Amino acid sequence: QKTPQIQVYSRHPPENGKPNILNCYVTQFHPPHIEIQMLKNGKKIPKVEMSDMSFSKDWSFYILAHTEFTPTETDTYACRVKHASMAEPKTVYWDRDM
Amino acid sequence: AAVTQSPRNKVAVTGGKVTLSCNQTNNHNNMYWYRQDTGHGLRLIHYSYGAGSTEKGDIPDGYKASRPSQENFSLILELATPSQTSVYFCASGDEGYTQYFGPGTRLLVLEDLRNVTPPKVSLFEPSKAEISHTQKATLVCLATGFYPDHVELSWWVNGKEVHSGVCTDPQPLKEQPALNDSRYSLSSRLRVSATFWQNPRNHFRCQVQFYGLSENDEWTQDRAKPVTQIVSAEAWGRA
Amino acid sequence: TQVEQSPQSLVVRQGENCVLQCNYSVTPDNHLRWFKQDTGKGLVSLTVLVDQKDKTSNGRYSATLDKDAKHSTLHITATLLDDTATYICVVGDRGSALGRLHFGAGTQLIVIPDIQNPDPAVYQLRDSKSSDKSVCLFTDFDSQTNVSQSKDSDVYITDKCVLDMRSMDFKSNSAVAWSNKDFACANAFNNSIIPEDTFFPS
Amino acid sequence: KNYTFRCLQMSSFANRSWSRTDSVVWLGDLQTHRWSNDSATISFTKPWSQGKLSNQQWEKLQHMFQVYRVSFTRDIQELVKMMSPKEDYPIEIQLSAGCEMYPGNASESFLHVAFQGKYVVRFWGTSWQTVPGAPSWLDLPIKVLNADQGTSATVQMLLNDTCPLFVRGLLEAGKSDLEKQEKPVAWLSSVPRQLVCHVSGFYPKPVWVMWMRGDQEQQGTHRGDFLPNADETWYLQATLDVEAGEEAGLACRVKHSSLGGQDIILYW
Ligand SMILES: CCCCCCCCCCCCCCCCCCCCCCCCCC(=O)N[C@@H](CO[C@H]1O[C@H](C(=O)NCc2ccccc2)[C@H](O)[C@H](O)[C@H]1O)[C@H](O)[C@H](O)CCCCCCCCCCCCCC
Ligand SMILES: *[C@@H]1O[C@H](CO[C@@H]2O[C@@H](C)[C@@H](O)[C@@H](O)[C@@H]2O)[C@@H](O[C@@H]2O[C@H](CO)[C@@H](O)[C@H](O)[C@H]2NC(C)=O)[C@H](O)[C@H]1NC(C)=O
Ligand SMILES: *[C@@H]1O[C@H](CO)[C@@H](O)[C@H](O)[C@H]1NC(C)=O
Ligand SMILES: *[C@H]1O[C@H](CO)[C@@H](O)[C@H](O)[C@H]1NC(C)=O
């Protein structure tokens, strides 16, 4: 059982008030059953696109979630992951500086 | 690569336990049980990939399977029903696609055993007219008064079974067609050359193996318990 | 029912060829096997076809398989009496023990034997142990003779049977009648249409 | 130059009755096909995903895979019955199959199988075999798979012939997408100090990102992993762990094939 790496990043340079795409890249997990949510202020973003699940040379699975977002000074974005390898859902917050 | 089945024929009562056994000495991991009914192809009941493993096939209901060893695969009917009247075939195989079939087991499940009755067997000797007309000699065997119709009629000359020159009616006939549990008759012919029949050292026997009750079966009637048994009739050749 | 055979049944005369057909929807179709099953007996494998377009032969049997059409035929050349049997088409859906077999319900073949020297007679045979009892044996008639059941319910007449004295290359039809009733061989087969030349001895 | 074509099958068997198989197909790092369990047919994810195959050859090839997917599924289920109680559900099976294309008419094909996330079995030459470190119980499934001559001949054909043929045509049809150049865009940021140079939107994957004070490359630069964007471009960041106050004079330089020697140079 392998415990998912979650990486959150924007497609274009983040600028407040400008529409962008937020990516959540989840990797290194198995078995392939997984739940991925992208959150705005802790609320589920409704239009979230998933790439098809795939796997690497090492046989671990990965998948890319993405959604349209407009970054502001106040709003928080996050990617939440439930997987059997983890007792609790893991939440990774978007941090633009990171 | 051979496969055997026992018994080859069984008459049972509704609600009784029946076990159909299949043996195979080929060291095949895989065994299969099927039943064959008129109007249908063989249908898979249960199978087994090895000892202590059994798998449901397409029509498992009313059957349990048992694989106690590599050699043996049993089909167990815990509560037999008339709907299980059928011919059962066991097969075995290795990793390849070929299934090697056993010879089949005929099961009849009756509602009640009260009418089961072994045959009388009579042997009728060649006509002198036939002999002088054709230089052949036809013996006729007659099994009568039996129920149900599960009999195997065979001919033996000097302790060895003969098939050449034999015909047996394909199905027994009803002695009282108007009646519910009519008893049956069956005839057979064995035709030989006159000189074979004329040879006083030739000993001819018509044998009827009857399938009826087992020793275990309860019997509350006055007449002899109509057990599975052989009945035969016999005559020697003569000038 | 993914395996269909045609005809359901057919009657042929000895020496004639016949063709039996098997059509299937089984997927995948690794191989197709033809079995012969004599009445009351087990399954005898005649041939197995494995290729996309395949032909096999085994003495008087030959078979074709066309996997594109999902169609096989079994041909029997110069039928003999012993070809009387059910012929069963089976398609295996794998090339290993992981496969399931899909059985057709069979085609019944009856082959009518050639009786070249008919000598139709009705003989009386007596019981080995009880001289009192007898049977009547109608024998050596050709295959255009039908044996009718009796009109009397206390009289028993069997259907005709053909026996084969193999070493003499000789076949003969017969039927048997008996009755506990008043009853004699002369009248035993009166309900049947029998040859005019029939021998009734003594 | 060299392109690897991978058909990635992922099959889950939760118990005796429930299962699903999903596949994706890649040529290099571009997805060419998707085959969802919910779908009777393989879907093209590129206009050119049929390669140079005629409709007739494509249909015939898809039909073989349609039968395969159903067959594989029952086969696993029966292999579990055969091995039980040694192996139980849940079971994950993955296949990675395809070919790597080299210059001239050279190629190499592969078909690798993982059971519970471990590579255990491959097709090699004319038969299935277990690889080193694989558990012994698999010798029975191998024996049973290797009894199937028809499957062995077909896989030999798929690997030796069909794959390199298909891929050559895919490379010709997909040429403009495969050789696409998309420019990176870079931006800078910092956390507790630690500087980040973000590079995003570049294709193809090879890229050079270095922190610089003038012309001196900063040895502490740490390139992160390549991260995909949803538009089939790439994202990469490079961090530099620095003392606070020493940011001025630092630049992030990016070299990429799409820029034609006009490197991105972003000053803090
Ligand atoms: C393979 C790389 C080249 C691809 C180039 C073309 C690319 C096109 C792009 C689209 C691809 C999208 C598909 C993604 C998934 C691909 C992954 C690779 C699969 C390769 C294996 C193909 C096997 C083909 C033959 C076949 O279907 N055989 C089955 C069907 O077989 C039947 O059909 C076979 C056949 O060849 N059929 C073709 C057919 C037949 C009738 C009609 C139409 C077609 C033969 O006739 C056989 O004799 C017969 O048995 C048979 O049931 C097999 O046993 C199925 C499983 C094979 C894989 C086993 C993996 C090992 C697992 C170990 C398990 C561990 C134990 C757990 C407990
Ligand atoms: C297909 O090619 C193989 C050899 O190729 C290797 O295995 C393939 C499945 C694929 O993964 C390739 O890229 C590999 O390089 C042939 O296998 C040989 O067969 C001969 C005779 O049949 C035998 O003597 C050799 O030992 C085999 N080689 C190996 C490594 O086992 C196979 O015959 C080819 N089949 C067809 C139909 O072309
Ligand atoms: C996957 O596809 C098969 C074949 O159509 C189907 O029977 C099965 O239910 C599907 N699995 C799931 C989980 O939907
Ligand atoms: C497995 O099948 C069971 C019923 O047998 C079903 O409830 C279940 O959803 C399936 N398992 C999983 C993990 O989805």
Side-chain angles (χ1 to χ4, degrees), chain A residues 1 3-4 6-17 19-46 48-72 74-81 83-89 91-98, chain B residues 1-63 65-110 112-119 121-127 129-170 172-179 181-214 217 219-239, chain C residues 1-7 9-40 42-54 56-115 117-128 130-131 133-143 145-150 152-179 183-195 197-202, chain D residues 2-15 17-58 61-87 89-117 119-171 173-179 181 183-192 194-214 217-218 220-240 242 244-268:
Chain A
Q1 210 157 52
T3 59
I6 311 165
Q7 293 174 276
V8 184
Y9 52 110
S10 62
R11 167 68 176 79
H12 310 280
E15 169 154 24
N16 286 338
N20 204 325
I21 292 171
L22 191 67
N23 297 331
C24 181
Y25 191 44
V26 186
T27 50
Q28 286 300 327
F29 56 99
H30 68 100
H33 190 259
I34 204 165
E35 197 197 310
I36 297 172
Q37 304 183 305
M38 306 187 69
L39 310 164
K40 180 175 178 188
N41 304 312
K43 295 155 94 172
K44 207 186 164 171
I45 299 163
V48 180
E49 295 159 60
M50 301 285 163
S51 74
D52 300 314
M53 195 168 294
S54 199
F55 58 83
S56 300
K57 209 158 316 163
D58 80 357
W59 306 101
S60 62
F61 295 89
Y62 63 82
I63 184 161
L64 175 67
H66 73 280
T67 194
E68 297 180 348
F69 85 126
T70 300
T72 61
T74 44
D75 294 318
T76 73
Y77 294 94
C79 185
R80 182 162 294 167
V81 175
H83 190 264
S85 63
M86 298 181 298
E88 294 276 356
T91 303
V92 167
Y93 290 89
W94 181 58
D95 184 339
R96 63 179 82 203
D97 291 295
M98 290 247 291
Chain B
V3 176
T4 70
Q5 279 175 244
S6 58
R8 293 295 308 280
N9 203 314
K10 174 69 171 177
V11 177
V13 73
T14 299
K17 192 181 160 194
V18 171
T19 302
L20 300 190
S21 303
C22 180
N23 184 86
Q24 163 273 121
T25 55
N26 312 308
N27 198 31
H28 286 167
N29 277 3
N30 315 310
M31 302 186 68
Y32 311 86
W33 269 114
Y34 299 83
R35 63 178 283 178
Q36 176 178 47
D37 305 277
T38 58
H40 294 90
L42 269 69
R43 292 177 292 170
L44 183 68
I45 304 172
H46 289 293
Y47 61 100
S48 172
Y49 284 129
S53 136
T54 50
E55 292 305 333
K56 291 181 158 167
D58 302 325
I59 53 155
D61 293 355
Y63 304 97
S66 173
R67 188 81 183 274
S69 63
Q70 186 80 328
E71 301 64 50
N72 296 311
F73 193 30
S74 300
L75 194 70
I76 303 155
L77 292 65
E78 304 272 19
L79 298 156
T81 60
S83 79
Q84 297 169 305
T85 297
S86 196
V87 187
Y88 294 83
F89 286 94
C90 170
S92 86
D94 57 22
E95 67 276 14
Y97 60 74
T98 307
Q99 293 192 12
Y100 300 86
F101 287 85
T105 296
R106 304 205 216 270
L107 176 62
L108 175 65
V109 187
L110 303 167
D112 182 87
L113 301 175
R114 75 191 135 86
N115 281 321
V116 178
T117 316
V121 178
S122 298
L123 179 49
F124 295 84
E125 290 173 22
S127 171
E130 180 193 2
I131 286 161
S132 59
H133 195 69
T134 69
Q135 294 312 325
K136 306 189 163 61
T138 310
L139 295 76
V140 168
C141 187
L142 205 47
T144 62
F146 62 96
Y147 185 92
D149 62 355
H150 280 219
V151 294
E152 297 168 339
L153 194 152
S154 62
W155 285 98
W156 301 70
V157 176
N158 292 345
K160 295 196 181 183
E161 195 175 0
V162 301
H163 300 285
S164 174
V166 170
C167 207
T168 297
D169 308 335
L173 66 76
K174 288 189 168 177
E175 312 192 335
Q176 303 286 292
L179 282 178
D181 283 31
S182 178
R183 291 165 173 187
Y184 299 91
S185 292
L186 176 79
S187 73
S188 189
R189 315 96 166 106
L190 169 61
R191 193 166 211 184
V192 298
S193 63
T195 69
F196 195 84
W197 168 250
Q198 286 163 351
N199 185 356
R201 298 177 65 166
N202 290 340
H203 190 193
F204 301 84
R205 184 177 302 273
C206 172
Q207 164 182 292
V208 178
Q209 168 76 251
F210 172 71
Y211 296 95
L213 274 56
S214 144
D217 291 333
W219 188 247
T220 51
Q221 274 174 61
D222 234 67
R223 55 191 179 94
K225 189 194 192 137
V227 296
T228 296
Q229 63 193 86
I230 290 161
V231 186
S232 72
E234 144 284 316
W236 292 84
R238 84 214 48 191
Chain C
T1 169
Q2 299 173 73
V3 181
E4 298 295 354
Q5 296 185 242
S6 195
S9 67
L10 70 163
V11 177
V12 313
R13 287 180 298 196
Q14 175 193 329
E16 301 171 344
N17 310 326
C18 63
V19 180
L20 284 31
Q21 176 172 5
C22 182
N23 288 279
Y24 62 91
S25 59
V26 182
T27 303
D29 51 341
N30 175 261
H31 65 275
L32 186 144
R33 180 182 308 271
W34 283 93
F35 281 112
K36 185 182 186 249
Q37 178 179 41
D38 300 340
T39 300
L43 305 168
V44 179
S45 184
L46 300 179
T47 195
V48 52
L49 299 122
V50 304
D51 288 339
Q52 201 61 37
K53 299 277 203 295
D54 211 352
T56 53
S57 58
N58 173 13
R60 296 174 305 98
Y61 315 112
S62 50
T64 58
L65 174 64
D66 175 350
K67 282 191 185 182
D68 294 2
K70 304 215 163 193
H71 175 60
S72 180
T73 67
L74 178 69
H75 311 230
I76 306 167
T77 303
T79 49
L80 297 177
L81 173 60
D82 282 13
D83 300 332
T84 297
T86 295
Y87 293 83
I88 295 160
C89 179
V90 189
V91 183
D93 62 20
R94 297 290 194 276
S96 80
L98 298 183
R100 296 293 179 100
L101 295 182
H102 303 258
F103 287 77
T107 291
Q108 311 202 10
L109 177 64
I110 294 174
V111 177
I112 301 150
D114 220 313
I115 307 290
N117 301 117
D119 192 355
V122 174
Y123 303 115
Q124 193 171 37
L125 290 64
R126 299 190 165 291
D127 190 311
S128 92
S130 186
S131 40
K133 179 65 188 302
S134 57
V135 301
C136 303
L137 175 82
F138 178 34
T139 185
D140 308 342
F141 48 89
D142 72 345
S143 288
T145 295
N146 300 316
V147 181
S148 291
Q149 204 64 26
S150 185
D152 189 286
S153 65
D154 286 347
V155 179
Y156 304 103
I157 303 184
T158 71
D159 204 4
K160 55 176 157 174
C161 219
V162 55
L163 61 83
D164 185 357
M165 308 185 63
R166 266 151 195 159
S167 72
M168 302 194 85
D169 190 34
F170 168 96
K171 300 194 182 70
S172 60
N173 284 322
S174 63
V176 179
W178 67 96
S179 178
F183 161 93
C185 296
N187 64 45
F189 296 92
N190 282 11
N191 216 39
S192 304
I193 297 192
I194 72 170
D197 54 285
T198 301
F199 179 54
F200 290 91
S202 194
Chain D
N2 300 325
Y3 287 99
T4 307
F5 176 74
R6 298 183 168 92
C7 301
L8 302 184
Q9 180 190 330
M10 55 223 99
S11 298
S12 303
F13 299 84
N15 46 56
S17 51
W18 193 103
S19 93
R20 73 173 293 141
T21 294
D22 303 281
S23 312
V24 292
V25 175
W26 303 88
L27 185 52
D29 65 7
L30 299 182
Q31 189 182 350
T32 58
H33 307 77
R34 168 186 48 249
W35 190 17
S36 169
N37 192 84
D38 308 316
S39 170
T41 58
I42 300 157
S43 317
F44 298 154
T45 54
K46 288 290 182 306
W48 44 269
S49 298
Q50 196 175 299
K52 290 289 186 181
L53 294 187
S54 75
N55 290 342
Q56 212 177 266
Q57 305 165 292
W58 176 249
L61 182 62
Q62 178 176 244
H63 185 239
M64 185 257 270
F65 285 109
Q66 296 170 319
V67 179
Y68 159 72
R69 179 177 80 168
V70 174
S71 298
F72 167 86
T73 300
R74 210 191 65 190
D75 282 6
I76 298 305
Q77 298 173 333
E78 294 299 318
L79 290 165
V80 172
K81 297 178 198 175
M82 182 174 300
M83 297 309 108
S84 79
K86 173 94 213 171
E87 292 315 308
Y89 295 114
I91 287 171
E92 179 69 23
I93 292 178
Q94 300 150 264
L95 269 73
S96 171
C99 44
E100 184 167 3
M101 314 299 297
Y102 304 105
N105 271 293
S107 68
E108 280 204 45
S109 291
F110 53 83
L111 202 181
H112 291 190
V113 180
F115 174 84
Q116 311 292 51
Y119 171 44
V120 286
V121 163
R122 71 175 176 172
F123 200 89
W124 184 247
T126 66
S127 63
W128 299 101
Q129 65 174 214
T130 51
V131 308
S136 301
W137 61 264
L138 277 165
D139 288 347
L140 186 39
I142 292 294
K143 182 170 200 55
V144 169
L145 290 171
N146 279 340
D148 181 358
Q149 295 186 318
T151 289
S152 162
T154 294
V155 171
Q156 280 173 65
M157 189 192 75
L158 287 174
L159 301 181
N160 297 6
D161 300 320
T162 309
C163 189
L165 186 66
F166 182 53
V167 182
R168 288 286 163 207
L170 271 180
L171 300 170
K175 164 163 253 262
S176 66
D177 283 356
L178 287 165
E179 302 193 341
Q181 293 285 338
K183 299 177 176 201
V185 164
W187 68 98
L188 310 178
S189 57
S190 66
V191 284
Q194 173 157 314
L195 277 47
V196 189
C197 181
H198 308 258
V199 188
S200 185
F202 61 97
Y203 192 88
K205 219 181 185 210
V207 76
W208 188 98
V209 182
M210 211 58 72
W211 282 94
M212 319 275 298
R213 182 172 313 274
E217 308 184 2
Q218 293 307 102
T221 302
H222 193 291
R223 158 206 236 77
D225 298 336
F226 289 94
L227 312 186
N229 288 320
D231 62 350
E232 298 202 306
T233 63
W234 288 107
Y235 176 94
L236 185 72
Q237 57 184 64
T239 68
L240 188 63
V242 316
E246 289 194 342
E247 305 109 333
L250 284 176
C252 178
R253 190 154 193 158
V254 184
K255 302 174 182 284
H256 189 253
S257 49
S258 60
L259 302 169
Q262 291 297 136
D263 300 344
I264 289 166
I265 185 84
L266 203 37
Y267 297 87
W268 179 264

